Design an enzyme around this catalytic site. Structure first.
Site, PDB file in Angstrom:
ATOM      1  N   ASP C  25      -3.385  55.042  60.872  1.00 32.99           N
ATOM      2  CA  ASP C  25      -3.052  53.802  60.156  1.00 32.99           C
ATOM      3  C   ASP C  25      -1.584  53.639  59.802  1.00 32.99           C
ATOM      4  O   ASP C  25      -1.130  54.108  58.744  1.00 32.99           O
ATOM      5  CB  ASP C  25      -3.883  53.827  58.890  1.00 32.99           C
ATOM      6  CG  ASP C  25      -3.827  52.547  58.120  1.00 32.99           C
ATOM      7  OD1 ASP C  25      -2.951  51.701  58.377  1.00 32.99           O
ATOM      8  OD2 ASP C  25      -4.681  52.404  57.237  1.00 32.99           O
ATOM      9  N   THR C  26      -0.865  52.917  60.662  1.00 31.33           N
ATOM     10  CA  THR C  26       0.559  52.724  60.461  1.00 31.33           C
ATOM     11  C   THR C  26       0.861  51.865  59.251  1.00 31.33           C
ATOM     12  O   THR C  26       2.002  51.837  58.784  1.00 31.33           O
ATOM     13  CB  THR C  26       1.216  52.102  61.703  1.00 31.33           C
ATOM     14  OG1 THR C  26       0.601  50.830  61.986  1.00 31.33           O
ATOM     15  CG2 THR C  26       1.003  53.020  62.947  1.00 31.33           C
ATOM     16  N   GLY C  27      -0.154  51.185  58.729  1.00 30.11           N
ATOM     17  CA  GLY C  27       0.041  50.336  57.570  1.00 30.11           C
ATOM     18  C   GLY C  27      -0.151  51.070  56.248  1.00 30.11           C
ATOM     19  O   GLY C  27       0.015  50.492  55.168  1.00 30.11           O
TER      20      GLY C  27
END
Lengths: 6, 103, 99
Positions: C25-27
Site C-alpha cells: 500500500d503506497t498510500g
C-alpha cells in the site's frame, strides 16, 4: 494516515 | 518515471479544468477526491476505509490527467482526508509496483 | 518481481512466526495489521484514514518477511479492515512505483 479504500 | 517511496508519492492532476495534488495509492481500489466542483450528474455510494465509512458522490467517465498522462474513469468525491488515485486509474497510466529481486 | 495493478497487490508475509496475506500500500505511511498475537511491550496510538480514526498497539523493531524479503520496523496492530504494508516497510524491500 493510512489510506486503502474499498 | 520511476518513483521511490521514502516520501509520499504525490503527483499533480488536472481534472474538471482544475489543478490538484493527489497520492498514487496502490491500496485503493477506487479514486477518491476531496469535495470539489465537478460537472454533471452523480450517484450516491458508500466506501470504507481504515476508520470506517464515508458517503461520496460517484461520477462516471471523468477525464483526469495524472502527471501528464490521460485517463478516463470513475471518480468519487467526498470527505476523504487526502486526494487518492486508486487502481481503477493507476492501470490506465501503466503504474507497476516493482520490488527487490534476486530474480 | 514487477507487479501490475489490475488486481489488489497482495503478498504473503511471515511475522511473529505466523503467515498472513497483506496489501502492498503506497498510500499508507505506516504498516497496520489486523489484531494478532505479537510478543512484547507496545504503546497505544491513534491513526486515521478514510472513515476516521482507530486506536492501535504500536510494536517497534518487528521482523517481518514480505514476499521473501526481510525488513525490521514498526508494526501497528488494530481494527483495520485489511492487513496493510506501508511505506515504512516498502522502502526496505526496494519497492518502486513506475509508470
Amino acid at each position: 494516515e493510512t489510506f486503502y479504500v474499498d | 518515471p520511476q518513483v521511490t517511496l521514502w516520501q509520499r508519492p504525490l503527483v499533480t492532476i488536472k481534472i474538471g479544468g482544475q489543478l490538484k495534488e493527489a497520492l498514487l495509492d496502490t491500496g485503493a481500489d477506487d479514486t477518491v477526491l476531496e469535495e470539489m466542483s465537478l460537472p454533471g450528474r452523480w450517484k450516491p455510494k458508500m466506501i470504507g476505509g481504515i476508520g470506517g465509512f464515508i458517503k461520496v458522490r460517484q461520477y462516471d467517465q471523468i477525464l483526469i490527467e495524472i502527471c501528464g498522462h490521460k485517463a478516463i474513469g470513475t471518480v468519487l468525491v467526498g470527505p476523504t482526508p487526502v486526494n487518492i488515485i486508486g487502481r481503477n486509474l493507476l492501470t490506465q497510466i501503466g503504474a507497476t509496483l516493482n520490488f527487490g529481486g534476486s530474480s
